[PDB]
Amino acid sequence: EFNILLATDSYKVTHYKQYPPNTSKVYSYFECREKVKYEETVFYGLQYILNKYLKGKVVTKEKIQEAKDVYKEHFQDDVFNEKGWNYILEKYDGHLPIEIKAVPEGFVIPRGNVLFTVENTDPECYWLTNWIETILVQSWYPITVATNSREQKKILAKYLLETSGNLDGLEYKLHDFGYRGVSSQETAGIGASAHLVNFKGTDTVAGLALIKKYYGTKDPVPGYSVPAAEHSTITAWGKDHEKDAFEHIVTQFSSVPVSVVSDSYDIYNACEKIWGEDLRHLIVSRSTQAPLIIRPDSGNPLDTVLKVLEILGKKFPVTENSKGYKLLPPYLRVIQGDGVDINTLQEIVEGMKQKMWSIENIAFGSGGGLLQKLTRDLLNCSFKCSYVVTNGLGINVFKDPVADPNKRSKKGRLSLHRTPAGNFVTLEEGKGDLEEYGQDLLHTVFKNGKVTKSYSFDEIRKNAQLNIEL
Amino acid sequence: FNILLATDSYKVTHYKQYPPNTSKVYSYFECREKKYEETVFYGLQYILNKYLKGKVVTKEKIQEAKDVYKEHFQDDVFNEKGWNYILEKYDGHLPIEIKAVPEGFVIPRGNVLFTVENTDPECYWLTNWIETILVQSWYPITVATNSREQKKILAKYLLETSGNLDGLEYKLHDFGYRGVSSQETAGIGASAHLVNFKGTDTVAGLALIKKYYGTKDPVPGYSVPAAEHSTITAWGKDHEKDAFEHIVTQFSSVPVSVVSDSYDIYNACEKIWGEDLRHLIVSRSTQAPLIIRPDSGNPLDTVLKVLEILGKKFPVTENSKGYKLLPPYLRVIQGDGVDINTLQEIVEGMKQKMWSIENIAFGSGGGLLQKLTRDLLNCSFKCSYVVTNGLGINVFKDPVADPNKRSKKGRLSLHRTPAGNFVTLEEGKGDLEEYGQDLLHTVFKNGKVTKSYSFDEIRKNAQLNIELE
Ligand SMILES: NC(=O)c1cccnc1
Ligand SMILES: NC(=O)c1cccnc1
Ligand SMILES: [Cl-]
Numbered sequence: 041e042f043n044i045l046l047a048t049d050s051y052k053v054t055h056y057k058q059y060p061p062n063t064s065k066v067y068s069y070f071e072c073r074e075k076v077k078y079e080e081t082v083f084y085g086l087q088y089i090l091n092k093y094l095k096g097k098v099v100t101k102e103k104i105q106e107a108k109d110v111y112k113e114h115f116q117d118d119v120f121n122e123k124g125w126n127y128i129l130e131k132y133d134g135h136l137p138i139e140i141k142a143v144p145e146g147f148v149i150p151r152g153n154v155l156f157t158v159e160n161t162d163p164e165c166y167w168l169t170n171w172i173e174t175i176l177v178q179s180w181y182p183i184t185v186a187t188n189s190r191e192q193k194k195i196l197a198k199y200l201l202e203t204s205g206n207l208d209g210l211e212y213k214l215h216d217f218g219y220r221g222v223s224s225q226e227t228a229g230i231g232a233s234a235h236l237v238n239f240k241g242t243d244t245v246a247g248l249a250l251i252k253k254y255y256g257t258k259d260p261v262p263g264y265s266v267p268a269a270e271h272s273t274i275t276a277w278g279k280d281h282e283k284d285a286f287e288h289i290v291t292q293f294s295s296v297p298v299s300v301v302s303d304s305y306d307i308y309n310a311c312e313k314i315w316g317e318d319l320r321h322l323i324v325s326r327s328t329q330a331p332l333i334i335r336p337d338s339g340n341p342l343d344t345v346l347k348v349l350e351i352l353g354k355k356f357p358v359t360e361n362s363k364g365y366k367l368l369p370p371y372l373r374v375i376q377g378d379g380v381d382i383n384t385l386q387e388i389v390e391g392m393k394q395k396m397w398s399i400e401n402i403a404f405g406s407g408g409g410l411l412q413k414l415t416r417d418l419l420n421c422s423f424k425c426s427y428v429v430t431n432g433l434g435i436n437v438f439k440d441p442v443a444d445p446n447k448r449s450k451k452g453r454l455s456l457h458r459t460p461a462g463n464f465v466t467l468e469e470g471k472g473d474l475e476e477y478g479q480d481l482l483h484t485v486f487k488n489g490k491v492t493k494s495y496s497f498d499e500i501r502k503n504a505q506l507n508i509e510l
Numbered sequence: 511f512n513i514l515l516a517t518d519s520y521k522v523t524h525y526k527q528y529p530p531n532t533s534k535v536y537s538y539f540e541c542r543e544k545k546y547e548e549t550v551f552y553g554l555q556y557i558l559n560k561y562l563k564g565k566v567v568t569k570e571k572i573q574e575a576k577d578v579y580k581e582h583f584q585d586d587v588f589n590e591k592g593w594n595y596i597l598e599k600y601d602g603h604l605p606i607e608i609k610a611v612p613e614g615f616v617i618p619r620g621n622v623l624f625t626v627e628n629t630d631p632e633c634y635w636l637t638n639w640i641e642t643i644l645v646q647s648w649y650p651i652t653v654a655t656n657s658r659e660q661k662k663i664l665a666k667y668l669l670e671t672s673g674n675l676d677g678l679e680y681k682l683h684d685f686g687y688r689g690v691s692s693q694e695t696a697g698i699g700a701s702a703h704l705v706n707f708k709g710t711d712t713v714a715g716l717a718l719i720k721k722y723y724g725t726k727d728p729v730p731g732y733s734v735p736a737a738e739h740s741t742i743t744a745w746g747k748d749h750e751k752d753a754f755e756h757i758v759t760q761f762s763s764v765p766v767s768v769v770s771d772s773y774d775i776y777n778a779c780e781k782i783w784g785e786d787l788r789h790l791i792v793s794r795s796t797q798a799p800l801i802i803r804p805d806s807g808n809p810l811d812t813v814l815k816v817l818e819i820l821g822k823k824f825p826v827t828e829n830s831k832g833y834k835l836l837p838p839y840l841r842v843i844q845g846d847g848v849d850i851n852t853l854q855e856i857v858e859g860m861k862q863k864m865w866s867i868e869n870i871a872f873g874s875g876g877g878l879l880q881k882l883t884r885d886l887l888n889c890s891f892k893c894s895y896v897v898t899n900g901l902g903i904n905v906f907k908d909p910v911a912d913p914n915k916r917s918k919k920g921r922l923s924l925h926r927t928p929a930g931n932f933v934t935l936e937e938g939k940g941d942l943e944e945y946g947q948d949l950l951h952t953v954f955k956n957g958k959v960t961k962s963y964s965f966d967e968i969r970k971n972a973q974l975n976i977e978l979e
């Protein structure tokens with residue numbers, strides 16, 4: 041079972057001996073520091089961490105002894121604070137004496153604002169606030185996935201609106217293909233759930249169970265998929281039988297959308313000759329609700345999309361929509377699922393617009409770009425101590441390195457408020473107590489071992505909506 | 511965990527897409543050739559034991575998967591009968607055979623690393639069901655490989671500036687626990703770094719190694735006391751010296767790392783460490799040095815300036831190679847901005863300024879464990895052989911626009927060449943015995959792990975040539 045005493049950076053085991061004597065409070069905060077610009081971030085994922093790792097009885101006699109034995113060997117010395125952990129076990133039945141206040145999940149907040157704060161509720165546990173930094177800072181990942189996915193939704197919305205005049209289908213425009221490309225099963229669920237804040241199409245099944253267990257949705261599931269081929273199900277037929285594979289697959293899934301990877305040997309031949317001529321009669325008979333979705337999967341992503349569209353536009357009837365953009369028939373669509381990240385997504389939709397193709401014709405799949413090619417440094421996610429009480433006196437604490445002004449941290453007790461113009465401001469040095477800015481938007485979400493406020497996944501999705509959708 | 515729900519959604523529909531009367535699907539993993547010329551094979555044994563062995567199918571898991579997929583596809587496409595067959599015939603144990611190169615082996619790109627096939631013809635669809643779970647081995651492979659490439663740089667420069675490799679296994683410390691995407695990732699990645707090094711702050715790696723691999727020693731990796739910004743800045747800006755004095759005094763007999771850049775790294779080194787607290791530093795033992803930690807600024811420029819400051823305040827020697835050496839009670843650790851590229855820049859810049867690599871160690875977090883993708887080594891799983899209507903067919907993909915994506919054909923095997931290198935033979939040609947015996951070993955068969963490696967063996971396998979020589 042998970043042991044929170046073994047879930048921190050090793051150096052944090054020694055910090056209880058390093059804080060100033062007579063310190064009764066350590067208060068810390070998380071922000072996406074100010075430095076695609078990523079001007080605003082979606083706050084998402086803390087509730088998972090609170091429930092899975094922090095709530096309830098998280099200390100036991102056995103976990104304390106386990107940690108003591110490991111740290112004796114790992115440091116080659118006795119430095120582990122057995123007394124302080126045993127105090128939590130005896131005093132609070134192993135429940136953490138910590139209070140966490142957070143902006144509501146799904147909220148979209150400009151960079152450089154407090155998103156959550158952490159402090160100890162018992163003076164003996166001044167060391168506990170930053171013990172749990174390592175666990176809590178991992179919220180950078182769902183925040184960053186949700187934010188990067190939302191920024192891709194903004195690009196798709198802009199170009200869909202310009203080329204088609206509406207946003208129909210926007211939710212299914214970016215599909216999660218990243219289960220194989222992430223570092224672990226646990227990451228797959230967390231990252232897939234973060235993408236589902238913005239979209240409804242996913243093949244990363246792990247995200248469904250996470251949302252069900254930790255957030256919840258009114259609908260039975262938060263994300264959906266369609267039948268689709270992979271190279272094994274095409275190439276297993278033999279190279280001379282690609283047409284037989286395509287025919288078998290489309291026939292098998294005649295009444296539902298079906299995606300068919302078309303680049304096993306020659307994507308351009310497959311489009312022009314196999315789909316275009318040999319099997320055309322099985323495509324033009326398809327329903328609007330069950331289109332054939334052609335999937336290239338190699339080559340330069342923009343050049344390949346444009347050439348596939350040109351081929352299909354010569355072999356199938358093409359209409360011009362009311363915005364002047366070309367539109368394939370409703371039984372035929374394309375999905376580009378190779379090489380897609382926020383930068384290439386932008387390149388593809390702009391190149392399509394230039395060649396007068398509607399964004400209605402295309403959807404995207406993204407794997408490593410969506411869930412793996414992201415780091416804590418993208419949004420400068422950081423956790424720092426801003427306030428301590430020593431000898432009964434509160435002092436404002438901060439770092440301000442000489443070589444990097446971007447690393448300067450906030451001072452004192454913090455609160456988050458709406459400005460007069462409707463923007464956001466973080467008040468420092470306890471100035472929120474003056475009440476000149478209205479109510480603090482941070483709410484207590486965890487106190488003394490209990491999750492005190494929770495959000496459904498439906499609420500999170502509403503909070504994370506685009507302005508354009510609004 | 512439910513393996514029925516641990517695959518890409520499209521794989522649920524693949525059983526209906528393969529040719530009728532297919533009795534075998536055989537697939538393989540490789541790090542495709544596209545510098546990262548060789549890869550450390552590591553991490554499959556974790557996956558086999560945690561996710562694939564034993565009774566992995568139950569009546570409840572089938573029902574759960576059926577109910578989820580009905581909603582997720584808005585259709586009934588899930589292969590309930592195929593999963594029930596595994597439950598009834600094999601007590602829920604997977605009828606799969608996996609063959610793999612030994613863990614820790616260092617293998618050039620473009621070679622077969624493992625193969626997967628079904629052992630019952632009814633379960634032809636199962637080989638690629640488990641692609642998604644197995645391909646996640648890219649992550650420990652890639653962490654281990656990139657960590658080993660950093661070890662090669664450190665060893666080259668340490669040998670050149672000092673004449674030996676003493677301390678090499680402590681020169682790159684894992685600072686990545688907070689900067690990875692999950693607790694599970696932290697343990698996997700930290701364990702892969704520990705194939706090459708012994709210093710880590712990512713505690714999760716220790717229990718994973720103990721549980722799935724094992725070591726003769728009580729633990730596979732080690733740490734030392736170290737400060738963070740909160741334990742310095744909590745004293746107040748005017749009391750940085752008091753924090754430093756308290757911390758070094760608290761850990762007088764062991765090595766201690768003290769982050770020194772909260773306000774002005776250069777003042778801290780020159781005035782606080784250099785003058786005010788110098789008496790507390792020059793009294794320390796060689797086994798308990800003060801390790802000064804810058805954490806901001808341009809990494810190379812900051813390291814060089816810190817060393818210049820310290821060389822003017824403390825007694826520097828010249829080692830037998832002609833390089834400058836701080837006294838043994840004083841060292842530096844650069845733990846900001848370190849990845850494989852900046853590590854190379856710093857050691858080369860130090861060498862140019864005549865500073866021994868003995869003076870420095872590195873801490874890497876995101877660069878070590880998170881800033882890596884499956885595309886770095888082109889880790890890829892593909893079907894190469896099927897049997898349909900009783901006839902074996904060699905299968906592959908060969909996309910026109912990308913020759914790099916061409917996959918291997920037929921049944922595969924891994925061999926030594928006459929010159930001692932590796933070669934992957936295709937099309938069953940290993941059976942001709944012109945190249946000796948296949949180097950892959952069966953590691954999983956019909957629900958059981960059949961061959962395994964300790965962490966100590968993996969470390970031996972992953973050693974550098976320079977270390978071996
Ligand atoms: N459904 C798909 O086409 C898919 C899913 C996951 C990875 N690659 C492709
Ligand atoms: N030990 C350290 O200095 C450390 C550990 C993890 C992250 N950053 C620094
Ligand atoms: Cl207990």
Ligand SMILES: [Cl-]
Nearest residue numbers: 269270271301
């Ligand atoms: Cl695929």
Ligand SMILES: [Cl-]
Nearest residue numbers: 737738739769
């Ligand atoms: Cl730190």
